[PDB]
Design a protein around this ligand. Structure first.
Ligand SMILES: N[C@@H](CC(=O)O)C(=O)O
Ligand SMILES: N[C@@H](CC(=O)O)C(=O)O
Ligand SMILES: N[C@@H](CC(=O)O)C(=O)O
Ligand SMILES: N[C@@H](CC(=O)O)C(=O)O
Lengths: 326, 326, 326, 326
């Protein structure tokens, strides 16, 4: 059987409450060893070694954990046949895309979580973790980039996003769809992500102890420019606009970011709209203002690519070409 | 035939480009008379009257236009049989929900936009506008609150949200689904919102020339607390958290809003996640911190209700009751 | 605590396999008492009483079980506070709609199943059953027609359909959306079905020991008229067409069904396409052929209403009005 | 510019009513040249030729039109740079998948329809046809198999299905998602189908004037075996079961098809359920009965492949392997 390393960061999958029927719970309580022990059928599928990286709610996920995870997977790539990362669902899609761009290991890296705590009735965590190990162990799962496995579905790290606040079926690749469905411990893969990922990226965080500072500003009716001005005053390297519709900006936000873009700051236009691309030739002349259009990358995912783009270049046209390639 | 009044505010429905096939256009440049005359079949179903209120892109929508729209509808209520509001798609879901809470006219208020400019090859605006007046002219549309009519579907002002950046079908009521479908100028209504609207709300904006200051902060991996601090430093009346997953906050954003809530700022927990409720009784103890759970209201819709809730009370407990009723 | 009767008919919820991690299983194996005892937290919320009516896979569901179920709920109404029906997922949407039309008990009737067998890892059945009793116990669930509770969601029996083949979240009200969502054993109801249900229908099956014979024919490229001719030759009281697109017929199937309609067979145009109404005033002149347009009712559900319609009348115009009202 | 041939079969795209306002229309009415002249901008992006193959509603589509279409494209492959096929929406998902498996030309074959007739207000036909020619003219569109272009989206011929009866956004690849989105005459392709197609399939219809007869039977509560028995009596080479849930069959229909499978009839288990695979190793022992699991292929699409499968082999294990490859 293949050897696979479970890297535990915490989440509701490692979360517990005082009863199976009450909704109240705390994330990142239970250890990796207790998770694997709860699913003995793992032994039938792979030789599992569990390592606790951190034990955190993914709402408190950060650059330092991102850095640790990338370096760990890249360092330990030769000493295992595949990786599973147990992780909270809140920012799974951010971590998944960071590693999708920064992992140089060509062996399956599969992220997994749970929407119900481990102590709850009909807890999704156990079967989620089994299916994650199935995917990480499947020979066919290699060279498809960093994967998320949730609700019997294999999702690429770029397009995967949390669509619902409670539903176990929350995770979908809302623009281009899933890679494959898992039935009876077997995957029928019909799709691979075309955007370049892992070893096909120039992003190398092996020596980096931090990432360039990129914040996100929300657009809406009567939107305050104070958030944008706060990141600008702090000398932020990048600002992602969660725009309205096709990445459009409230007038006062537009004013601040137009200034910022010409005074150092890399400005990427994304959208609060959960589905579809922020396009170039819309109502915003990106060439004129020196903006970057995120495309299908939602605000949090645009932040990831911009941060990593900023380790390579400050030039908008090159960042835009990066946003057209990765 | 019924008398219906068209209140124009701008949008891509009033948008124009040099090419029917190129995607480049500018918003809110075409006058209401032109949109009506473009649809001569309108005078088969209703006697239409056009009034230009503003001519702006809804990305620049604001408190002042909202207050104007509500006062005009409330003033002209019994001079007409119903209202259609032509409007940009970007923030139509915000304006729709504001009018839903503040309009005291029991006659149909139907908001309509277009995802392609008026000059576009297969422009959606014409049939959109026709179906908007059809809905506004339908006696069965009465007492359903403020409506959004897009892609042959009647959508309630509360749940309706922009789902896709470019798709004509973008507008869906993602949690509770639509009220009715339109075919051959007739509507089969099978739903009406339970949540109280229009004249059933205690909200009265008739004597208001400003609305309380409510800003929105985004949550993500390594989220900056500077946007939040900026808003409490400017003395903002309320702050809505665009939370991660089930309304969860990055620790730094949590600390700032926890301090703001104790100091007397109204703090509402919403979600970046496009469908589902931000619930009580998950990971955040709302009673302890004096936070409010937004429920199914997304950040920009949570802002509309928090603003109006603050014209009534500053008590977090009574703001939660309002978020449970409207 | 309220008194809640569990009527078990079988399904995957009562299904079993040799392994928790193996797909293979048989339906309708384990009895009511085993199901109820498997979730002892029911004792917190209701006084639960189990009755086995059948133990079958709902692929084998039939007129006889429907009649028994209906008469059982109608006769035993004033003995209990609510009913939960454990049932296979395959035809829950048919049974739910039958009871939606035939139950006269004004108390909550909630139907439940499981997409994973009882022996499965992360079995959905236990928490599905708990949430069903919650719904059946909630006073707010009254006067909403017969309900389906799956994946923390309360769904009206009319619009609810199986959307996916293996997904625990399979059940969606695809046209008009759910009635409410369940969190921490509490329901926020925002919707109720407008279409007449339960006591508001004239469909009394109390003294019927048989239902009118209604079959379904599928439409496709080069469709055979033989399935249709077989049902006409057996003298079937009604035929519903699973039409292509907006309930359109292949010429051969059209030819057979047209002649049958004029001979006194009730012919209902439904659609194979999973969402949207089969509409009047499309490509087919219903009035000329004496066909009935199923509207939002899919072929399965078109069958259930036609059967019940054929107990009141054989007149196409009357059946059409029945399809517009129920 | 590229040379693009347009092959017209009819459809609502070639459909007309007596009013832009009213829904009533007749399909396959308008000639290919009238569609071309209705889109002047075609000449900007390609040198377009038009040929009427047939002019029918696709509800009357059949094997004869399929074989002609496949042979035409295969013969005239060298004469042009790409094909667009104007086609009805009702059975376009069937024609697309047949061509997907039979056309040996490696140049883009793009299918288009319109949900609104050419005479309708905001008719989708014109911009649909433009965007089809864009896709057909894009070199990046090559080697992706037969395509469907509807609502600014490029969909693979295998997974694409009609999702809604009237909605312009009706066509979705519901299991694996679209290939690319079309903005401003340009496509961001991020996906290609892994399943083998066009010239990579062993299927050759070049010499065939007939297709193996394959019929479809529908499963539901109390399902008549008469339709299935009628096909077996007429000596059908194949029967596809529109199963319930995971391709399950009612008692009556199961016995008939179990009998049929033993006596040489190739029987494929599909599902009425609009998304997800009909899998092996559930409740039906496929080996024991000699049945074939359709996977993600819905009944009408399982028919297409079973017809082509039956020109190679009548061995159920050979046919199953074909359903795992194409
Ligand atoms: N707050 C949790 C939510 C979850 O995992 O379901 C986390 O992301 O860590
Ligand atoms: N920016 C435009 C978008 C549209 O109307 O489609 C607006 O909202 O005004
Ligand atoms: N065949 C089963 C499927 C399920 O219940 O999930 C039934 O409907 O009884
Ligand atoms: N009946 C038409 C429907 C359409 O094209 O929209 C056809 O398929 O030909």
């Amino acid at each position: 059987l293949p050897n696979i390393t479970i890297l535990a960061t915490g989440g509701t999958i490692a979360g517990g409450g005082d009863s199976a029927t009450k909704s109240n719970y705390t994330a990142g309580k239970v250890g990796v060893e207790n998770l694997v022990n709860a699913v003995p059928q793992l032994k039938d599928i792979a030789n599992v070694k569990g390592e606790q990286v951190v034990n955190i709610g993914s709402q408190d996920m950060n650059d330092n954990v991102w850095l640790t995870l990338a370096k760990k997977i890249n360092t330990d790539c030769d000493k295992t046949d595949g990786f599973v990362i147990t992780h909270g669902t809140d920012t799974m899609e951010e971590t998944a895309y960071f590693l999708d761009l920064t992992v140089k290991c060509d062996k399956p890296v599969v992220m997994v979580g749970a929407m119900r705590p481990s102590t709850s009735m009909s807890a999704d965590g156990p079967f989620n973790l089994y299916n994650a190990v199935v995917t990480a162990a499947d020979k066919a799962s290699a060279n498809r980039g960093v994967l998320v496995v949730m609700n019997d579905t294999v999702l690429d790290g770029r397009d995967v996003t949390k669509t619902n606040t409670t539903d176990v079926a929350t995770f979908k690749s809302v623009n281009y769809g899933p890679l494959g469905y898992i039935h009876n411990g077997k995957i029928d893969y019909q799709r691979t992500p075309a955007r370049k990922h892992t070893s096909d990226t120039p992003f190398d965080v092996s020596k980096l102890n931090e990432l360039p500072k990129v914040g996100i500003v929300y657009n809406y009716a009567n939107a305050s420019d104070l958030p944008a001005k706060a990141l600008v005053d702090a000398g932020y390297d990048g600002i992602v606009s969660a725009g309205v519709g096709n990445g459009n900006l409230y007038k006062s936000v537009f004013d601040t970011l137009a200034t910022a873009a010409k005074n150092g700051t890399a400005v990427v236009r994304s959208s609060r709209v959960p589905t579809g691309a922020t396009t170039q030739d819309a109502e915003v002349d990106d060439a004129k203002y020196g903006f970057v259009a995120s495309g299908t990358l939602n605000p949090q995912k645009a932040r990831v690519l911009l941060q990593l783009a900023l380790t390579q270049t400050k030039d908008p046209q090159q960042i835009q070409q990066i946003f057209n390639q990765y």
